[PDB]
């Protein structure tokens, strides 16, 4: 979720609204805003749907007043529904919320003893009757959120209004990132920077466990054990591009073919005299790279396979360990960690809770450094990372992630290449690496040419709801990207094996019906691949394979191909990745479902 | 596939057939055997289906003589069949294979070019195909074979007949597993010691690339250019176990209800006085634990989920890094090794080809030794390996992994014992191991009391075709484990995910429709495995929830509770295994499937 507050003389309904545009990407089934004005009258307005029908609806009837808080939802508690989106109130108190209450169990049940009815069936909504409670007993809005803030378990960003004293507004921060912007005789705070960047430029990050008293002419900053504090401002110079659709029918179909560019501008300055140059990370950065004696990655959904594939090139072409881990996995057990073990989170957005909490813990366990390889500048990953590679793709919308993947893997190949030259590891590997990153634009822009006749092939699951995909090698992880994007945005059940693993069980699944993907360069890894591929053939399923012109395979009842140009191998697992973000695209198309914005999801989970 | 042979004064047909029951566990699509008297008429007899239709159809007409080769298949190119069936034929030459040819295509397509007919879809047919045309050329059988053998890439247990001369019977070994019976005035040969056991104890194994030249007289062997060499003879004390239903209606029933015993012989003889004792790898196995910095395991299907449960363990009790990997994918790739690691192998036969294969590869590398933990005795795998540990479940006939399963867990605990203490870490830890392994058995009793409730909840699955588990931490491979078990058997499209990852992506996949099985031990991640679960609720989804008796769930119209009796952290991965056994196994029942023998697989998979 994303949440952004406002505090001035004029009304704030528009900024609120145009915070919530920009947030979005952090969820689109809810919205809601609660402006106040000098009287103390509240007027607070909800919709069940995207940030737009807020909108919509706010035009209708307009919003007076100089005080507000806004919020966009990605519901964990409570199915979406105008009952339990954001604000939720407690009589004067007005919340909204951006995390999880893990023990709104208990809270809820004892705020009830005491006399609250609970309309919603959110975990936000204890927050809203716990600070009306502390209040009762007497006290200012900072006092009482004071003694709330202790009772709550898990993490918040949250913003709390008393529309009686619209005077003041107090944020406190658990997990959650929360930005205040300083204005001119007004105040504002946010999820992130890009949402206040409309009126103003001038920033303090709320630290762990911070609370903030914010009024139009002042903030004053408490830390966790209450002591009053000053936290540092700065200036941004940061953009924000909307993205657009230019003549495409969807975001995602846009990010698709944008690849070229994106690549292209993901090298741009870092190759140089023929060898990677990584100059940006500063003047001393090859010192710590230098001691690099293993990699740990951590990342969630796509960015986690991008970190599978870097695996087989981490090791495989640098000789260097290399271990990568769902990181809410990570952040839960009790891990080895290794010597002079470099920490590396991979994430598009930047937000991603599982991403952050992993990384935050890694900084009590003693990696060298942290290096963050994001798409989105000033975002949470890279303010708290030591070091940061931007992938530099331009914004990203659709849910289903493309260029951010393929620019990810050619920002590991560029590190795979830096780091083999650190080593004093034969200069040729970074050569054979440079070729091919070099080559992967016009390699792919011609993968492009071949869209219709995946557009032809979808057809072909248009009534099916299974899809196994197989690969072998640096192809397996292109195996799960294939599956992930066409369960995500068609809903078809698709599951991605090894190729070698299927029929050690999962190959019961096959029957006539059952359709399997496959990528299958033409490498030392082929003959292998084709007889997992005759194990499925002899039980009835039918082949989809993206199969490179020299795999020689042949086309039949059961064995449908789709020949791919030879491609450098070094670049081939984000070669053949495309293909199959194409075939999750006009599988969708086929479906219905909407595209960009697929139901149950988010384009960034910010909480656990 | 499953190869025996035979040469004899007496008819060798019924020892054949005894043969083939006890390698079933290798194939059971169909079934072959060929036999000729000294005079030179051969019957050759195939029958698609278990070895049982074979046996009938020979009880029928028996096939009289003393040279023969039998064969049970487990189909990987071309469809289960009666023409697919081994023994495959080229006129005089007769041919039983346990392998892949790989470079198949090209050697069909020249034999083609010569004049053979291909009758069958199998790669089996080029190595009768090429024997004959080896022989046309010139000499012996036995020189026609050091011919062939050359120019066929993969693997092969073979065993080769010319009818014409029934006194010689030839046999090639690569890969796959081969031994030769010694008899009295008769030689025999087959996949495995068991299934010869009736006729002979006296056995000789052949090495990779050996050429046996058999009669009932002599065993003379060669190697791959065709030097004589000698392999030395070795007597068997193995016993054979034929495996029993008792009062149940299936094994995996029986072999459900027999984890407690089977966890009972498991530890035998390993618990001194609270203590781990592994003696029983020898007098100086310390001065090798005690080197061991590193755990590299390797292993496929359920065997790659229990050396998933053990890495958590590794790490957080022993503070050991430990690596798991698929043993298809960690053969063909270039890895990086860790200093001192410890390669072990995970597996119920002993006879999984990629687990060897990985095993084969991992003598070229420099680990500190090999240890296997199996469950078959003078299998390839504890053979060829420097350590053993045997799980001592008895032999497990059901398709599906159940006791395997969990012996595999206790020794892993066993082995995370052991080392901590030899790290000298706090002697308390292999207490809690120790004091929570002794429990285990009759903790197991306890659950399996509630069978009838599991029954019942299965009755819910009737109408599914998915299926979604979820577990975090050590429980997460065994929400893998679950939706292995239930695919196998069931049907149903069952897929697992480590419960924080289900929201990047795979939530989509979430309606009013979805059930979710969810592992829930009452422990530190409670909560937050609990907001994953609220999360699915709230787009839709059933929930089936086997839940500590305390962690506090209710029952409502979308929540199934299956409460579970308390137990130690240390053992709760195994404990909460057998209700996910138990549900497959109902499930399986409920949608009428073959339970202890599924469509499309075998027990165990001896081909890559
Ligand atoms: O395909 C869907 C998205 O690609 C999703 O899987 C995403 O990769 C994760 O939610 C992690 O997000 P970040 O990359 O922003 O950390
Ligand atoms: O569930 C079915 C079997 O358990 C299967 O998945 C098995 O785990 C693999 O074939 C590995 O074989 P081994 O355990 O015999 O090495
Ligand atoms: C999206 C977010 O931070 C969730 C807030 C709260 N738990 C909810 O509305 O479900
Ligand atoms: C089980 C086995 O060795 C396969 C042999 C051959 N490829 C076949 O019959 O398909």
Redesign the interface.
Request: aromatic content about 6%; glycine content about 8%.
């Given at each position: 979720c994303g949440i952004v507050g406002a505090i001035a003389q004029r009304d704030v309904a528009e900024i609120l609204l145009e915070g919530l545009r920009r947030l979005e990407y952090r969820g689109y089934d809810s919205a809601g805003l609660a402006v106040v004005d000098a009287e103390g009258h509240m007027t607070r307005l909800r919709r069940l749907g995207k940030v737009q029908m807020l909108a919509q609806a706010a035009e209708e009837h307009p919003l007076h007043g100089g005080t507000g808080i806004a919020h966009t939802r990605w519901?964990?508690?409570?199915?979406?529904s105008e009952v339990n989106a954001h604000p939720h109130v407690s009589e004067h108190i007005v919340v909204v919320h951006n995390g999880?209450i893990?023990?709104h169990?208990p809270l809820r049940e004892e705020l009830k003893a005491r006399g609250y009815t609970f309309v919603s069936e959110t975990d936000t909504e204890v927050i809203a009757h716990l600070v009306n409670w502390e209040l009762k007993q007497g006290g200012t809005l900072r006092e009482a959120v004071l003694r709330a803030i202790p009772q709550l378990?898990?993490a918040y960003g949250t913003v709390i209004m008393d529309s009686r004293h619209p005077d003041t507004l107090l944020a406190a921060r658990s997990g959650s990132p929360l930005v205040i912007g300083l204005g001119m005789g007004e105040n504002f705070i946010a999820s992130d920077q890009l949402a206040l960047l409309p009126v103003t430029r001038r920033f303090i990050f709320l630290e762990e466990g911070d609370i903030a008293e914010i009024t139009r002419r002042s903030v004053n900053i408490f830390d966790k054990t209450g002591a009053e504090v000053k936290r540092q401002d700065i200036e941004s110079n940061l953009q924000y591009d909307a993205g657009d659709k230019g003549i495409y029918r969807h975001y995602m179909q846009k990010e698709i073919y944008e690849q070229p560019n994106a690549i292209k501008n993901t090298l741009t300055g870092r190759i140089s005299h023929g060898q990677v140059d990584l100059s940006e990370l500063g003047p001393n950065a090859d010192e710590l790279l230098s001691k690099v004696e293993h990699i740990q990655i951590l990342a969630?959904?796509?960015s986690?396979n991008s970190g599978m594939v870097s695996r087989?090139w981490?090791?495989?072409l640098a000789?260097?360990?290399?271990?990568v881990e769902?990181?809410?996995?990570f952040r839960?057990?009790?891990?080895?960690?290794?010597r002079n073990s470099l920490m590396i989170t991979l994430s598009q957005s930047g937000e991603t809770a599982?991403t952050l909490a992993g990384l935050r813990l890694s900084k009590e366990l003693g990696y060298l450094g942290s290096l963050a390889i994001c798409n989105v500048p000033g975002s949470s990953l890279v303010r708290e990372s030591d070091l940061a590679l931007m992938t530099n793709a331009g914004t990203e919308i659709g849910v289903?992630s493309t260029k951010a993947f393929t620019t990810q893997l050619t920002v590991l190949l560029m590190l795979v290449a830096k780091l083999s030259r650190l080593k004093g590891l034969d200069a040729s590997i970074e050569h054979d690496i440079v070729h091919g990153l070099q080559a992967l634009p016009s390699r792919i822009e011609q993968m492009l040419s071949q869209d219709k006749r995946i557009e032809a092939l979808a057809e072909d699951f248009s009534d099916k709801?299974?899809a196994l995909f197989l690969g072998?090698?640096d192809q397996?992880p292109i195996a799960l990207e294939g599956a992930?994007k066409l369960?995500?945005?068609s809903?078809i059940?698709a599951?991605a094996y090894?190729?070698?693993?299927l029929?050690?069980?999962?190959?019961?699944?096959?029957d006539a019906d059952m359709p399997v993907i496959v990528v299958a360069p033409n490498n030392?890894?082929l003959?292998?691949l084709?007889?997992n591929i005759?194990?499925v053939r002899?039980?009835?399923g039918q082949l989809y394979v993206f199969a490179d012109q020299d795999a020689?395979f042949v086309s039949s009842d059961n064995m449908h191909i789709i020949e791919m140009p030879h491609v450098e191998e070094v670049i081939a697992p984000i070669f053949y990745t495309v293909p199959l973000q194409l075939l999750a695209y006009h599988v969708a198309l086929i479906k219905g479902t909407d595209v960009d914005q697929?139901?149950?999801?988010a384009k960034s989970?910010t909480?656990?």
């Amino acid at each position: 979720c994303g949440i952004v507050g406002a505090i001035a003389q004029r009304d704030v309904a528009e900024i609120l609204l145009e915070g919530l545009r920009r947030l979005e990407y952090r969820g689109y089934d809810s919205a809601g805003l609660a402006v106040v004005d000098a009287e103390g009258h509240m007027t607070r307005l909800r919709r069940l749907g995207k940030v737009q029908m807020l909108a919509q609806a706010a035009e209708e009837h307009p919003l007076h007043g100089g005080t507000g808080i806004a919020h966009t939802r990605w519901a964990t508690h409570g199915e979406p529904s105008e009952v339990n989106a954001h604000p939720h109130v407690s009589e004067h108190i007005v919340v909204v919320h951006n995390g999880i209450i893990e023990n709104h169990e208990p809270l809820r049940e004892e705020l009830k003893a005491r006399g609250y009815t609970f309309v919603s069936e959110t975990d936000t909504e204890v927050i809203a009757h716990l600070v009306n409670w502390e209040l009762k007993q007497g006290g200012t809005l900072r006092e009482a959120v004071l003694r709330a803030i202790p009772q709550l378990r898990g993490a918040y960003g949250t913003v709390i209004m008393d529309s009686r004293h619209p005077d003041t507004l107090l944020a406190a921060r658990s997990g959650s990132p929360l930005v205040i912007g300083l204005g001119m005789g007004e105040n504002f705070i946010a999820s992130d920077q890009l949402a206040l960047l409309p009126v103003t430029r001038r920033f303090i990050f709320l630290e762990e466990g911070d609370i903030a008293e914010i009024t139009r002419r002042s903030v004053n900053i408490f830390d966790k054990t209450g002591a009053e504090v000053k936290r540092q401002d700065i200036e941004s110079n940061l953009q924000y591009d909307a993205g657009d659709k230019g003549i495409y029918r969807h975001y995602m179909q846009k990010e698709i073919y944008e690849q070229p560019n994106a690549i292209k501008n993901t090298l741009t300055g870092r190759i140089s005299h023929g060898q990677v140059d990584l100059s940006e990370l500063g003047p001393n950065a090859d010192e710590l790279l230098s001691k690099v004696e293993h990699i740990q990655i951590l990342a969630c959904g796509t960015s986690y396979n991008s970190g599978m594939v870097s695996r087989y090139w981490f090791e495989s072409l640098a000789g260097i360990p290399c271990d990568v881990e769902i990181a809410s996995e990570f952040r839960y057990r009790k891990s080895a960690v290794r010597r002079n073990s470099l920490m590396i989170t991979l994430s598009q957005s930047g937000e991603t809770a599982d991403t952050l909490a992993g990384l935050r813990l890694s900084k009590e366990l003693g990696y060298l450094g942290s290096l963050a390889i994001c798409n989105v500048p000033g975002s949470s990953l890279v303010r708290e990372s030591d070091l940061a590679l931007m992938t530099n793709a331009g914004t990203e919308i659709g849910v289903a992630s493309t260029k951010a993947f393929t620019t990810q893997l050619t920002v590991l190949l560029m590190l795979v290449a830096k780091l083999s030259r650190l080593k004093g590891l034969d200069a040729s590997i970074e050569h054979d690496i440079v070729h091919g990153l070099q080559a992967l634009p016009s390699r792919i822009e011609q993968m492009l040419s071949q869209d219709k006749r995946i557009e032809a092939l979808a057809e072909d699951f248009s009534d099916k709801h299974h899809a196994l995909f197989l690969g072998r090698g640096d192809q397996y992880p292109i195996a799960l990207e294939g599956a992930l994007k066409l369960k995500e945005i068609s809903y078809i059940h698709a599951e991605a094996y090894a190729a070698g693993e299927l029929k050690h069980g999962p190959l019961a699944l096959i029957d006539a019906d059952m359709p399997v993907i496959v990528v299958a360069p033409n490498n030392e890894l082929l003959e292998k691949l084709k007889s997992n591929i005759e194990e499925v053939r002899a039980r009835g399923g039918q082949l989809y394979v993206f199969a490179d012109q020299d795999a020689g395979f042949v086309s039949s009842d059961n064995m449908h191909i789709i020949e791919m140009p030879h491609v450098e191998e070094v670049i081939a697992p984000i070669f053949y990745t495309v293909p199959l973000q194409l075939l999750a695209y006009h599988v969708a198309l086929i479906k219905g479902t909407d595209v960009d914005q697929p139901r149950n999801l988010a384009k960034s989970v910010t909480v656990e």
